[PDB]
Amino acid sequence: MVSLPRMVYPQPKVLTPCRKDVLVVTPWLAPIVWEGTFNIDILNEQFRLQNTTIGLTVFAIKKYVAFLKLFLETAEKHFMVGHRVHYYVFTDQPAAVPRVTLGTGRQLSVLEVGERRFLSEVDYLVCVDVDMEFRDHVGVEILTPLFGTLHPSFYGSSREAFTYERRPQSQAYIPKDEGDFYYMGAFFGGSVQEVQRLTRACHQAMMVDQANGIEAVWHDESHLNKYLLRHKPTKVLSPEYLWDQQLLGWPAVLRKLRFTAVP
Ligand SMILES: CCCCCCO[C@@H]1O[C@H](CO)[C@H](O)[C@H](O)[C@H]1O[C@@H]1O[C@@H](C)[C@@H](O)[C@@H](O)[C@@H]1O
Ligand SMILES: O=c1ccn([C@@H]2O[C@H](COP(=O)(O)OP(=O)(O)O)[C@@H](O)[C@H]2O)c(=O)[nH]1
Ligand SMILES: [Hg+2]
Ligand SMILES: [Hg+2]
Ligand SMILES: [Hg+2]
Ligand SMILES: [Hg+2]
Ligand SMILES: [Mn+2]
């Protein structure tokens, strides 16, 4: 709404693309987020002027509570620093959640397991796996109504090789001649409204499948892929945002490894 203040930064050059080695915009005109495609100062200004609050949700059930300390401490160094952040930790062991020191404007809620809340508390929801650590900047460049992340093992694969659910009997079914990308279930998000629409659709689809005695090959991730095929994401995150260095190394196409699998 409000005007940006005067800012001094390099002029963007029309006849000079930032990245020539990768696709930076999808066929439906959604940016694909890679290092070099965004000026974080301009984006931070835009989002701070709106007093943006980001919710970060993670599940830590059974032995996975062990991953919380590193996850949260690294999120404090790299995730949305400067912005309001609300962590939501869903766990079966509330007393096992580590006591992590948080920066100002950041809070954590422990929710025991064994909603309209989000609508009134945050503007965007980011949903990720907990067996991970942040190694570099993950900020407002990802925020948009609905986003998915390119799975690190398939970003260079032909659609026929994607491990989508291939049985027509499943709600997650995607035939061999369809598909844009293979999105990983470990990192998705968007506005609260869009994330709840997505989770509701996948939940209903999974219930239909269960009633028909079938379980999608990659569970929730198969359904996330069917949803994002039919409801195109407004931004797509590159594999910089979901990487496994032990498994895949550090390819030239990745200028930064931002959020990675814990060995
Ligand atoms: C040594 C195991 C190799 C797995 C590589 C492909 O990753 C898996 O892809 C499937 C879909 O085909 C699922 O998305 C699954 O969750 C992925 O495995 C997980 O992510 C990879 C990157 C790696 O960190 C594995 O250890 C994870 O289990
Ligand atoms: O005992 C378990 C198994 C899974 N998870 C949660 O479900 C996510 C998906 O599981 P996992 O990381 O094992 O899957 P992978 O990335 O290996 O495919 C984990 O990050 C956790 O957030 C959990 O909390 N406890
Ligand atoms: Hg979520
Ligand atoms: Hg998640
Ligand atoms: Hg689901
Ligand atoms: Hg989903
Ligand atoms: Mn995981």
Side-chain angles (χ1 to χ4, degrees), residues 57 59 127-129 185 188:
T57 70
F59 291 72
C127 313
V128 302
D129 273 17
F188 62 91

mmCIF file with all atom_site columns, all heavy atoms in Angstrom, residues 57 59 127-129 185 188, ligand 4:
data_model
loop_
_atom_site.group_PDB
_atom_site.id
_atom_site.type_symbol
_atom_site.label_atom_id
_atom_site.label_alt_id
_atom_site.label_comp_id
_atom_site.label_asym_id
_atom_site.label_entity_id
_atom_site.label_seq_id
_atom_site.pdbx_PDB_ins_code
_atom_site.Cartn_x
_atom_site.Cartn_y
_atom_site.Cartn_z
_atom_site.occupancy
_atom_site.B_iso_or_equiv
_atom_site.pdbx_formal_charge
_atom_site.auth_seq_id
_atom_site.auth_comp_id
_atom_site.auth_asym_id
_atom_site.auth_atom_id
_atom_site.pdbx_PDB_model_num
ATOM   1  N  N   . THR A 1 57  ? 5.536  -24.014 10.517 1.00 0.00 ? 57  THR A N   1
ATOM   2  C  CA  . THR A 1 57  ? 5.030  -25.206 11.183 1.00 0.00 ? 57  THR A CA  1
ATOM   3  C  C   . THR A 1 57  ? 5.907  -26.407 10.979 1.00 0.00 ? 57  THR A C   1
ATOM   4  O  O   . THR A 1 57  ? 6.408  -26.636 9.890  1.00 0.00 ? 57  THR A O   1
ATOM   5  C  CB  . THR A 1 57  ? 3.608  -25.561 10.697 1.00 0.00 ? 57  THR A CB  1
ATOM   6  O  OG1 . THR A 1 57  ? 3.658  -26.027 9.341  1.00 0.00 ? 57  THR A OG1 1
ATOM   7  C  CG2 . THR A 1 57  ? 2.696  -24.361 10.771 1.00 0.00 ? 57  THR A CG2 1
ATOM   8  N  N   . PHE A 1 59  ? 6.387  -30.690 12.476 1.00 0.00 ? 59  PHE A N   1
ATOM   9  C  CA  . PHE A 1 59  ? 5.914  -31.788 13.297 1.00 0.00 ? 59  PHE A CA  1
ATOM   10 C  C   . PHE A 1 59  ? 7.134  -32.502 13.835 1.00 0.00 ? 59  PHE A C   1
ATOM   11 O  O   . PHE A 1 59  ? 8.117  -32.723 13.125 1.00 0.00 ? 59  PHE A O   1
ATOM   12 C  CB  . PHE A 1 59  ? 5.035  -32.735 12.478 1.00 0.00 ? 59  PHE A CB  1
ATOM   13 C  CG  . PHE A 1 59  ? 3.730  -32.130 12.085 1.00 0.00 ? 59  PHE A CG  1
ATOM   14 C  CD1 . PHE A 1 59  ? 3.677  -31.142 11.102 1.00 0.00 ? 59  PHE A CD1 1
ATOM   15 C  CD2 . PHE A 1 59  ? 2.559  -32.482 12.744 1.00 0.00 ? 59  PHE A CD2 1
ATOM   16 C  CE1 . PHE A 1 59  ? 2.476  -30.511 10.787 1.00 0.00 ? 59  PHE A CE1 1
ATOM   17 C  CE2 . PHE A 1 59  ? 1.355  -31.856 12.438 1.00 0.00 ? 59  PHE A CE2 1
ATOM   18 C  CZ  . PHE A 1 59  ? 1.315  -30.873 11.462 1.00 0.00 ? 59  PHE A CZ  1
ATOM   19 N  N   . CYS A 1 127 ? 5.362  -24.625 5.732  1.00 0.00 ? 127 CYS A N   1
ATOM   20 C  CA  . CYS A 1 127 ? 5.289  -25.969 6.301  1.00 0.00 ? 127 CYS A CA  1
ATOM   21 C  C   . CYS A 1 127 ? 6.484  -26.787 5.876  1.00 0.00 ? 127 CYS A C   1
ATOM   22 O  O   . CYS A 1 127 ? 6.658  -27.032 4.684  1.00 0.00 ? 127 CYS A O   1
ATOM   23 C  CB  . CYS A 1 127 ? 3.982  -26.608 5.799  1.00 0.00 ? 127 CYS A CB  1
ATOM   24 S  SG  . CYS A 1 127 ? 2.490  -25.455 5.976  1.00 0.00 ? 127 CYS A SG  1
ATOM   25 N  N   . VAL A 1 128 ? 7.294  -27.207 6.841  1.00 0.00 ? 128 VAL A N   1
ATOM   26 C  CA  . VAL A 1 128 ? 8.509  -27.945 6.510  1.00 0.00 ? 128 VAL A CA  1
ATOM   27 C  C   . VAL A 1 128 ? 8.778  -29.161 7.383  1.00 0.00 ? 128 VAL A C   1
ATOM   28 O  O   . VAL A 1 128 ? 8.190  -29.316 8.460  1.00 0.00 ? 128 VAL A O   1
ATOM   29 C  CB  . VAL A 1 128 ? 9.781  -27.013 6.605  1.00 0.00 ? 128 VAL A CB  1
ATOM   30 C  CG1 . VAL A 1 128 ? 9.647  -25.799 5.672  1.00 0.00 ? 128 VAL A CG1 1
ATOM   31 C  CG2 . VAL A 1 128 ? 10.003 -26.553 8.064  1.00 0.00 ? 128 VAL A CG2 1
ATOM   32 N  N   . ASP A 1 129 ? 9.666  -30.012 6.894  1.00 0.00 ? 129 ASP A N   1
ATOM   33 C  CA  . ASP A 1 129 ? 10.137 -31.191 7.634  1.00 0.00 ? 129 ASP A CA  1
ATOM   34 C  C   . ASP A 1 129 ? 11.086 -30.662 8.735  1.00 0.00 ? 129 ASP A C   1
ATOM   35 O  O   . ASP A 1 129 ? 11.754 -29.625 8.579  1.00 0.00 ? 129 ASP A O   1
ATOM   36 C  CB  . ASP A 1 129 ? 10.933 -32.124 6.711  1.00 0.00 ? 129 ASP A CB  1
ATOM   37 C  CG  . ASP A 1 129 ? 10.056 -33.121 5.963  1.00 0.00 ? 129 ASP A CG  1
ATOM   38 O  OD1 . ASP A 1 129 ? 8.834  -32.933 5.885  1.00 0.00 ? 129 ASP A OD1 1
ATOM   39 O  OD2 . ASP A 1 129 ? 10.634 -34.089 5.445  1.00 0.00 ? 129 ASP A OD2 1
ATOM   40 N  N   . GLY A 1 185 ? 7.385  -32.736 -0.712 1.00 0.00 ? 185 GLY A N   1
ATOM   41 C  CA  . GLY A 1 185 ? 6.456  -32.463 0.369  1.00 0.00 ? 185 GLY A CA  1
ATOM   42 C  C   . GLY A 1 185 ? 7.066  -31.797 1.589  1.00 0.00 ? 185 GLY A C   1
ATOM   43 O  O   . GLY A 1 185 ? 6.320  -31.348 2.449  1.00 0.00 ? 185 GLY A O   1
ATOM   44 N  N   . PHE A 1 188 ? 6.514  -26.397 1.603  1.00 0.00 ? 188 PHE A N   1
ATOM   45 C  CA  . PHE A 1 188 ? 5.491  -25.724 0.805  1.00 0.00 ? 188 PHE A CA  1
ATOM   46 C  C   . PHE A 1 188 ? 4.874  -24.643 1.678  1.00 0.00 ? 188 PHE A C   1
ATOM   47 O  O   . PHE A 1 188 ? 5.151  -24.585 2.888  1.00 0.00 ? 188 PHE A O   1
ATOM   48 C  CB  . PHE A 1 188 ? 4.412  -26.696 0.291  1.00 0.00 ? 188 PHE A CB  1
ATOM   49 C  CG  . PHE A 1 188 ? 3.622  -27.370 1.380  1.00 0.00 ? 188 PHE A CG  1
ATOM   50 C  CD1 . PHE A 1 188 ? 2.440  -26.819 1.870  1.00 0.00 ? 188 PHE A CD1 1
ATOM   51 C  CD2 . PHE A 1 188 ? 4.100  -28.538 1.948  1.00 0.00 ? 188 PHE A CD2 1
ATOM   52 C  CE1 . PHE A 1 188 ? 1.751  -27.438 2.935  1.00 0.00 ? 188 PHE A CE1 1
ATOM   53 C  CE2 . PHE A 1 188 ? 3.429  -29.157 2.998  1.00 0.00 ? 188 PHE A CE2 1
ATOM   54 C  CZ  . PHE A 1 188 ? 2.250  -28.605 3.496  1.00 0.00 ? 188 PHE A CZ  1
HETATM 55 HG HG  . HG  B 2 .   ? 5.193  -30.046 6.726  1.00 0.00 ? 4   HG  B HG  1
#
